[PDB]
Ligand binder design. Structure first.
Ligand SMILES: [Mn+2]
Length: 250
RNA sequence: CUCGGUGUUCCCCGCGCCGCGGGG
């Protein structure tokens, strides 16, 4: 429920994209869960099962019943990244969602200062924010953006992409609300409207093991909803790299 | 205190009849 954001203000002349900070932090001997890798699988965090039909299918495949969830699978059954590297053109930062992940932020803090000050030179500002994730309905529409929404599949350049993007935002807000035990208002109250899907484009998917041949869909979004979102909410894929951050217009 | 990458499969979970979802 509690979010901690270590935020660095970048000097006017300087870029340090969230992926750049993430890549540089990977050279600093941090725990795998900082990078959303489950330390008990050696692979990226993934969702948990729960079904009696899924058990049956698992038994047919493997010849035994599913093992217990790992510690991260039990704590994080919807596989939402507890650490995200976030930012925009003017700042970069580390977001911990939940007290569980705050020690990972703490371990990365001096490394992050080293990286940002070495890349940017002098003039880096620092803030440390704390927020309570909350979602509450409104009577009138509130304007939001999504910065660099990533959709691994399904983002087109044609007019129906506004509806597709709207559905992806609803799906993501429902997933976070379930994960954090928050109440979403009725959809007819929320009444999401995607006003603009800005410059729908491609982005080559790069992993820690190198650049792939997959491209993902990437766009910027303006939308309205009768919702007051407090804290940092996300939509789409690849959010541990800061994609899909929802931003209230001010 | 939103709008760097112009377009699809490298891996891990999972579902379906290659396709789709989730993680990176
Ligand atoms: Mn409407």
């Amino acid at each position: 429920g509690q979010q901690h954001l270590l935020r660095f203000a970048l000097p006017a002349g300087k870029k340090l994209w969230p992926n750049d900070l993430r890549e540089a932090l990977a050279k600093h001997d941090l725990p795998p869960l900082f990078f959303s890798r489950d330390p008990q699988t050696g692979h990226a965090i993934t969702r948990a099962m729960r079904n009696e039909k899924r058990v049956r299918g698992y038994i047919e495949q493997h010849g035994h019943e599913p093992p217990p969830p790992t510690e991260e699978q039990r704590a994080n059954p919807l596989a939402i990244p507890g650490i995200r590297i976030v930012g925009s053109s003017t700042w970069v930062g580390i977001l911990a969602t939940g007290e569980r992940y705050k020690p990972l932020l703490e371990a990365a803090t001096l490394p992050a200062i080293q990286i940002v000050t070495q890349r940017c030179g002098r003039g880096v500002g620092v803030e440390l924010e704390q927020h309570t994730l909350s979602i509450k309905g409104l009577d009138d529409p509130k304007r939001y953006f999504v910065r660099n929404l990533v959709m691994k599949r399904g983002l087109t350049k044609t007019a129906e992409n506004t509806t597709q993007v709207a559905s992806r935002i609803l799906s993501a807000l429902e997933r976070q609300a379930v994960a954090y035990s928050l109440d979403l208002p009725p959809t007819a109250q929320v009444d999401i409207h995607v006003e603009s899907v800005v410059r729908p484009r491609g982005m080559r998917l790069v992993t820690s093991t190198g650049a792939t041949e997959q491209f993902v869909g990437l766009a910027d979004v303006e939308f309205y909803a009768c919702l007051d979102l407090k804290g940092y909410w996300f939509a789409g894929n690849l959010t541990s790299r800061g994609y899909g951050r929802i931003i209230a217009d001010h």
